[PDB]
Design a protein around this ligand. Structure first.
Ligand SMILES: *[C@@H]1O[C@H](CO)[C@@H](O[C@@H]2O[C@H](CO)[C@@H](O)[C@H](O)[C@H]2NC(C)=O)[C@H](O)[C@H]1NC(C)=O
Lengths: 982, 647, 47, 148
């Protein structure tokens, strides 16, 4: 067995292809050797070494022992790999890093940092007598007995969470102690506060060890709730302040609304008022607030200015994951465009403090941001999309664009830029002038058959590379790459028309606009691009572009996408390079209103090109004086607030809109041009009415020697080939208390037979990225999972896959890692937390209910509605239960009205048993509030079943034995309620 | 017969205040002399010059400080390599070609930590001194080179106080992992460089902690058959790992700097981690019979690399640990000479002070040492001396010897060994040495030695040196002459009266702060008459206590063995004189470093413990060039400074 | 500005000096930035 | 440019995108044209009639009135309660992005409607040419330029 592996290792000890044999021999019980080698893109020798070592390793692993397997992994794991710099411990930041003038004697007092650390204080004196390294003095901050608690990132409302912790005792002698928990209102605990924070049960830790801590809680309210933990011992008392983040059920969905304020109509029609209506979505999670933030900034560029200058974060594309070098460049995009605005227009007086220090800070952040991509650069100065992956023509072009633009304000290394440009033009430019891609990275999915898709992608890549080379040409103005630019420009000129898509037409037009703008064929391309223009209004208030050609698709989109903003941005930049000022104003208005709170847009490319369009337009037109009285108020409610926007302050902080009324933003006569964006965040219970561009399936299995298997497959659009999607993302939300095996994920990306190109675990999410998801078959990620802490009433999680550059091509699906049913009953006590906030059905035919308590409960000012219904249908949707009922007799209506004998919907949390309703039976139901939805073309009302919702079974006949009297008093109350009007 | 001696550093240092000594003899009437550094070879330009007066009031000895200004030298294509040292007077005019260096000062790069993780910021400052160990106040350029060889950042800053604070270097979110280099340099005039390193490593969450404890830090002859290794492992919640699988692989390593190692697939022994602790024994002999080696005579100064993998049984998680190398040690002792020049003076007893250290370079006491020696005279007639034996002084670690050789001896090949009662003959320490006789055409020799060197010289005390000449022409020597050098600069010089009523006479030298941390003393007398004047010289190296000129001391009030988190504490800084102080507070765990006093005495152009094959070699080994009308026969191509020899 | 070989070198003060290309070309070094003594090729600059 | 002949013959239901989209009034010779007038389908197509919700703005107050359209080929008989209004779509763009209505009265007014979502600019310009031809020099109102 050793010699059978000694031969293998000895064969590939100094082999050119050595890694392929190594990760060929790795265990993969889900795919054959040929299926794994089918993904190898490093040549035939790597495929043959991989296949050999894979087959031999699979034959040797038959009927093995654990010691034999581990010894084999010892033989392979040492001789073939090299090494990797990594550290298992973290070191806190140093401090006291200061210089002092010491007149022979100087004392300075401070506070030691909060840490268990042996600090080492080192002094170095400098004087006219030389240098003196003082004796290093030690300062050990140490705690012998201390508690720590492990609080999860988030917890879904209703889940019963076990909070685990540990008390540490480093003293050699054991001791008594007790930890107690701080009871907050929203957090429901099984026990009850004594005097108000839990109880002290004295336990003992043994000397030089630890003791476990557990606290079961059940959050009833959404939001961040403070929880304290007290550790008490005969030697003191410690308080640990903590925070539990409670998240609603269902999926988060985010909609955006944009409005441009032009009070004097300088760039278009006058715009002084706008009304953002309050509309409740269809599948809204019950007892959850509709969140919406209001952001009113000063200029077209004000949102990006606020994003960079307000350092509370921040990424303008947080919904897209890191991993690709594109993300590292996008991190420096906003700082660059802000700096370009402030420097080119000389607007440093916006700062109330010293402008020179602010220009310093921005220059430093710009340099630091520009360094982020250096990891993805290879020795030959090419760039790779994935760290350690193959060099990409596309990404090298993009890096040349960002670097070439940044070089204006932070000078770049000319020799490096030269080597990158020459790597492009010397290797991956064909005779016809086009550029070809080296790697398998597919940034975009285009239409047409395989040949037509090839032509389209070739045109797109050539234009993209041309943009990159043009943006960085002045750094390294070589005659060779100018000749390359000429050949590529010729290819674009000859091959753009006839167009196959507005997207490639636009990017080709913008690439050619960076060169000779007098060529006739370029003018023809600009004409063809103008022919595809869409307008809102006549005379047009808006002008934008759809990425599909008109002769292929005549329908007009109702909401924007990334391709829409990117095509419109390319057309806008082409027009700006042509100085076509009459044509861009409605385009600028459309891109400005399509912008998002934070400054970004839908994906990365549309974001950078739209930011360049807005900024370049802002620098090209006259800067108007800014003076508005902006008042935001609710329609049928109080005035929210108002502020006077001037050039002094115009990046004001956002404001949360809490009330459920329609919002109204208005201004009087003003000077300037402000932007008003509203971001709405809701949580929905369903995803059925969303267009799915992927077939999804996900399951949990038991394995031999629990595991999640998540499969996706691409659904090609119209005229799209079966080649598969472009750069894709598989985001798997993990349920509460479920932890993923990171080794399984590493094994799927680190090898030459990689299935995925990058992975990460962020905030309870397993985020994988991919070059392409197939259309022909399913692709599955498989990774083991384990239970970190115990969770009861586990809320389902989500499985989302989408195209990185087309987040609109997506599909979201719910799943649960627990099979757990049934939900029959909660049995007595240890129960008040589950049944805390939901309704309890009255006792069946209970005659002790005294008709006046049935009226006083109905006439309660808290109780909004109260009437008698008949249930028609039961339905179970995800985490909730919906009851279709008929509204029979109305007894009270405080807020909106519903019609008699109309269909009324009820909703209760599925995790509520004592409110079990039987289909076909009548019930008297009284409660608070409702939801008014617009379904089809009419209204609909949905009523949640919570606490203080009085429900009672109501038979229609009178053969219920003694319930003849029951219905007697029931109809007594029912008769008395409407004849009085309390 | 009238003579003149011009003493200068072996090499001129651009921008340095170079002190030039002139000592003339035989002159009774006063006269002036001009010392000058001019351009080579035309002497059209005078880089600097000074006038010195020589009189009976002056004892016909004087000094002049010259400076080659950096701005006075061209830049770029055809830079200056040589200058002319020139002395002109009514009596004589002599010049010499002197090489120059553009290395001036010291640049110490100080980063807060040596290891960083992504998104951290590297705090970095530079301590900048000129050649005279004073705040350079020169603008400085910092360069950052990543593990892939790319220069990713450069920043220059002016220097006001000798401490240069630079902006923090932000490590990227996804950086290049590995060894980063920081390079400090002066923007103008000089070629001085500084260099520091810091690693950027990727953080990986560990499941548990694994510790390896070898029986000893070195492997001797007693543990060459069995070497105990204890492998412990515990969870980070302060509990011992109950059951796990321990796999241990062993390798042979050349040096710890190179990450190359030769594994041994024969000693892959596997054991069980039970209740936190496991133990194995490594039979070195049997395992190193693999990969050749075979014997313990080999493997000496090589290392034993140890690799351990621990696989916890409950959760199946695995964690690794490694010992980089345990040096195989053939002899528990290492020998080195102390304050014994390898040069013989015919007629003077030759002393040999051997020194014994352990594997930690610590002075081992009570160690017997045996000294053997062979002698070769002018007739090539070899003679084997009778062996001698001393015991290591336990007060200073010294084992002293004194040797009486015939006057005609020329070469002394002496060998020293340790004589431990419990060591085999192979495991003893052995060192060989060769000493050559000083050559003089007048059979004239000089030997200096200052009472004795234990303890080391403390600033403020006094150095009572003994000057013993052996020669004809003894009772016609008028005086003795001396030059004291420190840190590559002549700090003192002078002349003492020779007593006609003795063979030796004590010359007293007050040891001053200028002599920290080391100095060199050259003493010579002039033999005159017919033929040509002769300089008879000797030199010694003075190791002096490392004492700061402006001593810094930091203390923490209150003083306690341990502190509590968030505790308000006061730090007291005390200096001898008004001084700047750069402070740092670093988690010591980063170290698992720098010593300035040793890197500072690279500017000493002398080598060895003193002495020389002849007068010119004595001056050369002391870091001196000289101009003389006396005999100046030196070796060939002797223009660069000496290089300290290694063995 | 064609196949003229150029050189990256250190001068007597430690500064990086590049030489070998005639007027109108640029020296491109395909080595890492930390290679002191390197060889490169000249490329024609625009005008 | 191009030729503006589109959608022959003119069908009102086709000009209304078969009741799947909303249209906004952008030009009208009616001096009393409601500001920010937008018509959107308020129900399904039952028989020859079709519910149409009309939103508009009076001052700073938004209002909405329900109407019923009776479609007969190119003619549309709109009505609300007792008020009736006769219209005939006299032109419809090739992609049904905009159309030109003719309302009947003593002085027949002409209106231009277009998709609220936007339309192809060449087709919108064609509808504009048709409306300028029919209006023949009369003053046009632009209800969508009323700060909507
Ligand atoms: C959890 O502990 C924090 C820290 O002590 C409490 O915050 C303090 O509350 C007291 C009143 O109870 C105030 O007088 C202090 O000013 C608060 N300090 C801070 C820093 O906020 C907090 O009230 C505790 N929470 C619970 C639920 O007991």
């Amino acid at each position: 067995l050793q010699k059978k592996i000694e031969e293998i290792a000895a064969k590939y000890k100094h082999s050119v292809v050595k890694k392929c044999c190594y990760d060929g021999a790795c265990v993969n019980n889900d795919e054959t050797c040929e299926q794994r080698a089918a993904r190898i893109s490093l040549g035939p020798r790597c495929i043959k070494a991989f296949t050999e070592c894979c087959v031999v390793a699979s034959q040797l692993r038959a009927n093995i022992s654990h010691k034999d397997m581990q010894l084999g992994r010892l033989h392979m794991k040492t001789l073939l790999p090299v090494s990797k710099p990594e550290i298992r411990s973290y070191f806190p930041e140093s401090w006291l890093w200061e210089v002092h003038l010491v007149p022979r004697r100087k004392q300075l007092q401070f506070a030691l940092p909060d840490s268990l650390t042996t600090w080492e204080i080192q002094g170095v004196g400098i004087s006219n007598t030389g240098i003196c390294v003082a004796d290093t003095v030690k300062a050990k901050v140490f705690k012998d007995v201390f508690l720590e608690m492990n609080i999860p990132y988030s917890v879904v409302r209703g889940e019963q969470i076990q909070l685990k912790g540990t008390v540490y005792n480093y003293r050699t002698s054991g001791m008594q102690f007790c930890v107690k928990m701080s009871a907050v209102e929203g957090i429901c605990t099984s026990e009850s506060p004594v005097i108000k924070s839990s109880k002290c049960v004295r336990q003992k830790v043994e000397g030089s060890s630890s003791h476990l801590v557990t606290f079961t809680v059940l959050p009833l309210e959404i939001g961040l709730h403070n929880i304290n933990f007290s550790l008490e011992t005969w030697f003191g008392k410690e308080i640990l302040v903590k925070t539990l983040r409670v998240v609603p059920e269902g999926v988060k969905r985010e909609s955006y609304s944009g409005v441009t304020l032009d009070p004097r109509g300088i760039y278009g029609t006058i715009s002084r008022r706008k009304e953002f209506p309050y509309r409740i979505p269809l599948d809204l999670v019950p007892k959850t607030e509709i969140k919406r933030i209001l952001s009113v900034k000063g200029l077209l560029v004000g949102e990006i200015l606020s994003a960079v200058l307000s350092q509370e974060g921040i990424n303008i594309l947080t919904h897209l994951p890191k991993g690709s070098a594109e993300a590292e460049l996008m991190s420096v995009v906003p700082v660059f465009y802000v700096f370009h605005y402030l420097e080119t227009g000389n607007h440093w007086n916006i700062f109330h403090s010293d402008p020179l220090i602010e220009k310093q800070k921005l220059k430093k952040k710009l340099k630091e941001g520009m360094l982020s991509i250096m990891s993805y650069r290879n020795a030959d100065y090419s760039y790779s999309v994935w760290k350690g992956g193959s060099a990409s023509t596309w990404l090298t072009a993009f890096a040349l664009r960002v670097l070439g633009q940044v070089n204006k304000y932070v000078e770049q290394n000319q020799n490096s830029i030269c080597n990158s440009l020459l790597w492009l033009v010397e290797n991956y430019q064909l005779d016809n002038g086009s550029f070809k891609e080296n790697s398998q990275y597919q940034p975009i999915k285009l239409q047409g058959t395989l040949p037509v898709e090839a032509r389209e992608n070739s045109l797109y890549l050539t234009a993209f590379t041309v943009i990159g080379i043009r943006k960085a040409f002045d750094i390294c103005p070589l005659v060779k790459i100018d000749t390359a630019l000429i050949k590529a420009d010729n290819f674009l000129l000859e091959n753009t028309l006839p167009a196959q898509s507005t997207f490639t037409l636009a990017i080709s037009a913008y690439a050619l606009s960076l060169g000779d703008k007098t060529h006739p064929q370029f003018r023809s391309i600009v004409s063809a691009l103008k022919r595809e223009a869409l307008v809102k209004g006549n005379p047009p208030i808006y002008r934008f572009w759809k990425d599909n050609l008109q002769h292929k698709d005549s329908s007009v989109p109702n909401t924007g996408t990334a391709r829409m903003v990117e095509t419109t941005a390319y057309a806008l930049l082409t027009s700006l390079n042509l100085k076509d000022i009459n044509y861009v104003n409605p385009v600028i208005k459309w891109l400005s209103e399509e912008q998002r709170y934070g400054g970004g847009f839908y994906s990365t490319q549309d974001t950078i090109n739209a930011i360049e369009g807005l900024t370049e337009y802002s620098l090209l037109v006259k800067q108007l004086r800014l003076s508005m009285d902006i008042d935001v108020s609710y329609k049928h409610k109080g005035a929210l607030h108002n502020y006077k926007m001037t050039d002094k302050n115009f990046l004001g902080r956002p404001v949360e809109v809490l009330l459920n009324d329609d919002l109204i933003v208005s201004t009087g006569f003003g000077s300037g041009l402000a932007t008003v964006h509203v971001t709405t965040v809701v949580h929905k219970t369903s995803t059925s009415e969303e267009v799915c561009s992927f077939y999804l399936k996900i399951d949990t299995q038991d394995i031999e020697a629990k595991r999640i298997v998540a499969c996706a497959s691409y659904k090609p659009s119209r005229e799209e080939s079966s080649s598969g999607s472009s750069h894709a993302v598989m985001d798997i939300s993990l349920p509460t208390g479920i932890s993923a095996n990171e080794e399984d994920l590493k094994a799927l990306v680190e090898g030459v037979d990689q299935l995925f190109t990058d992975y990460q675990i962020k905030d309870g999410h397993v985020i994988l990225q991919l070059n392409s998801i197939p259309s022909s078959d399913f692709l599955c990620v498989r990774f083991r999972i384990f239970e970190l802490f115990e969770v009861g009433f586990l809320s389902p999680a989500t499985f989302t896959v989408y195209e990185y550059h087309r987040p609109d091509k997506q599909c979201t699906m719910f799943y649960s890692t627990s099979n757990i049913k049934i939900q029959k009953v909660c049995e007595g006590a240890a129960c008040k937390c589950v049944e805390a906030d939901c309704g309890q059905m009255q006792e069946e035919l209970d005659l002790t209910i005294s008709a006046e308590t049935r009226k006083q409960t109905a006439c309660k000012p808290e109780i909004a509605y109260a009437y008698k219904v008949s249930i028609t249908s039961i339905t179970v949707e995800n985490v909730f239960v919906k009851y279709k009922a008929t509204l029979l007799d109305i007894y009270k209506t405080g807020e909106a009205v519903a019609e008699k004998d109309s269909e009324i919907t009820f909703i209760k949390k599925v995790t509520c048993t004592n409110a079990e309703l039987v289909k076909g039976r009548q019930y008297l139901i009284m409660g608070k509030e409702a939801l008014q939805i617009k379904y089809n073309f009419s209204f609909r009302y949905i009523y949640p079943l919570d606490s203080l919702t009085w429900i009672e079974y109501w038979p229609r006949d009178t053969t219920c034995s003694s319930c003849q009297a029951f219905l007697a008093n029931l109809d007594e109350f029912a008769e008395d309620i409407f004849l009085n009007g309390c | 017969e009238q003579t003149y001696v011009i003493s200068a550093p072996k090499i001129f240092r651009v921008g340095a205040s170079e002190n030039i000594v002139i000592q003339v003899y035989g002159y009774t009437e006063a006269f002036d002399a001009t010392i000058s550094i001019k351009s080579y070879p035309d002497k059209k330009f005078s880089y600097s010059s000074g006038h010195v007066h020589l009189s009976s009031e002056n004892k016909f000895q004087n000094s002049a400080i010259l400076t080659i200004q950096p701005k006075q030298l061209p830049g770029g294509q055809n830079p200056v390599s040589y200058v002319y040292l020139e002395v002109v007077s009514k009596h004589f005019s002599k010049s010499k070609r002197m090489p120059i260096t553009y290395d001036n000062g010291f640049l110490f790069i100080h980063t807060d930590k040596p290891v960083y993780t992504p998104d951290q910021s590297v705090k970095v400052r530079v301590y900048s001194l000129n050649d005279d160990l004073k705040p350079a106040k020169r603008e400085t350029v910092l360069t950052f080179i990543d593990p892939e060889g790319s220069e990713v950042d450069m920043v220059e800053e002016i220097d006001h106080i000798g401490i240069i604070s630079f902006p923090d270097f932000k490590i990227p979110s996804n950086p290049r992992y590995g060894m980063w280099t920081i390079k400090a340099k002066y923007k103008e005039d000089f070629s001085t460089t500084g260099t520091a390193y810091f690693e950027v490593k990727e953080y990986v969450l560990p499941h548990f902690s694994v510790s390896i404890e070898p029986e000893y830090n070195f492997i001797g002859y007693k543990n060459f058959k069995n070497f105990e290794i204890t492998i412990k492992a515990r969870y980070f919640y302060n509990k011992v790992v109950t059951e796990a699988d321990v796999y241990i692989t062993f390798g042979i390593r050349e040096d710890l700097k190179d990450d190359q190692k030769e594994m041994m697939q024969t000693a892959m022994q596997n054991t069980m981690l039970i209740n936190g602790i496991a133990q194995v024994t490594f039979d070195s002999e049997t395992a190193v019979k693999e990969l050749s080696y075979y014997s313990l005579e080999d493997l000496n100064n090589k290392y034993l690399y140890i690799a351990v993998t621990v696989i916890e049984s409950t959760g199946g998680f695995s964690e690794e640990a490694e010992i980089p190398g345990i040096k195989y040690v053939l002899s528990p002792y290492k020998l080195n000479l102390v304050a014994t020049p390898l040069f013989l003076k015919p007629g003077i007893p030759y002393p040999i002070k051997v020194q014994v250290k352990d594997s930690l370079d610590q002075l081992v006491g009570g160690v017997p040492v045996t000294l053997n020696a062979q002698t070769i005279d002018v007739n090539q007639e070899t003679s084997d001396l009778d062996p001698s034996k001393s015991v290591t002084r336990v007060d200073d670690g010294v084992a002293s010897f004194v040797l009486n050789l015939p006057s005609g001896v020329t070469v002394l090949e002496f060998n020293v060994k340790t004589d431990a009662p419990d060591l085999p003959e192979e495991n003893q320490a052995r060192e060989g040495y060769r000493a050559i006789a000083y050559s003089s055409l007048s059979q004239s020799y000089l030997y200096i030695d200052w009472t004795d060197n234990h303890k080391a010289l403390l600033v403020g005390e006094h150095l009572n040196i003994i000057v013993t000449p052996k020669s004809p022409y003894i009772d016609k020597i008028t005086h003795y002459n001396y030059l004291i050098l420190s840190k590559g600069k002549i700090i003192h010089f002078g002349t003492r009266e020779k007593f006609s009523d003795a063979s030796y006479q004590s010359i007293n030298i007050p040891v001053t702060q200028n002599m920290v941390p080391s100095s060199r003393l050259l003493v010579y007398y002039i033999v005159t008459g017919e033929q040509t004047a002769e300089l008879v010289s000797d030199s010694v190296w003075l190791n002096i206590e490392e004492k700061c000129g402006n001593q810094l001391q930091v203390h923490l009030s209150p003083d306690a063995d341990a502190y509590s988190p968030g505790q308000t504490v006061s730090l007291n800084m005390a200096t001898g004189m008004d001084s700047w102080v750069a402070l740092a507070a670093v988690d010591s765990a980063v170290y698992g470093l720098e010593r300035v006093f040793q890197f500072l005495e690279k500017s000493d152009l002398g080598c060895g413990a003193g002495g020389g094959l002849n007068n010119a070699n004595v001056f050369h080994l002391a870091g001196l060039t000289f101009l003389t009308n006396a005999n100046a026969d030196d070796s060939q191509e002797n223009d660069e400074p000496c290089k300290e020899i290694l063995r | 500005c064609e196949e003229v070989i150029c050189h990256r070198k250190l001068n007597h003060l430690g500064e990086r000096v590049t030489s070998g290309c005639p007027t109108g070309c640029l020296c491109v070094i395909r080595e890492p930035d930390n290679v002191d003594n390197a060889n490169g090729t000249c490329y024609a600059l625009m005008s | 440019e191009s030729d503006c002949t589109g959608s022959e013959p003119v069908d009102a239901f086709q000009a209304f995108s078969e009741g799947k989209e909303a249209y906004v009034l952008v030009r009208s010779t009616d001096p009393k044209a409601r500001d920010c007038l937008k018509g959107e389908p308020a129900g399904e197509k039952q028989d020859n009639t079709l519910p149409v919700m009309m939103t508009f703005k009076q001052g700073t107050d938004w209002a909405s009135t329900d109407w019923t359209f009776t479609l007969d080929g190119a003619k549309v008989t709109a009505t609300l309660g007792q008020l009736t209004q006769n219209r005939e779509v006299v032109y419809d763009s090739q992609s049904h992005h905009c159309h030109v209505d003719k309302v009947e009265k003593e002085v027949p007014d002409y209106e231009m409607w277009m998709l609220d979502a936007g339309g192809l600019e060449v087709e919108v310009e064609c509808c504009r040419q048709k409306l300028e031809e029919l209006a023949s020099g009369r003053n046009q109102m632009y209800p969508h330029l009323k700060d909507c």
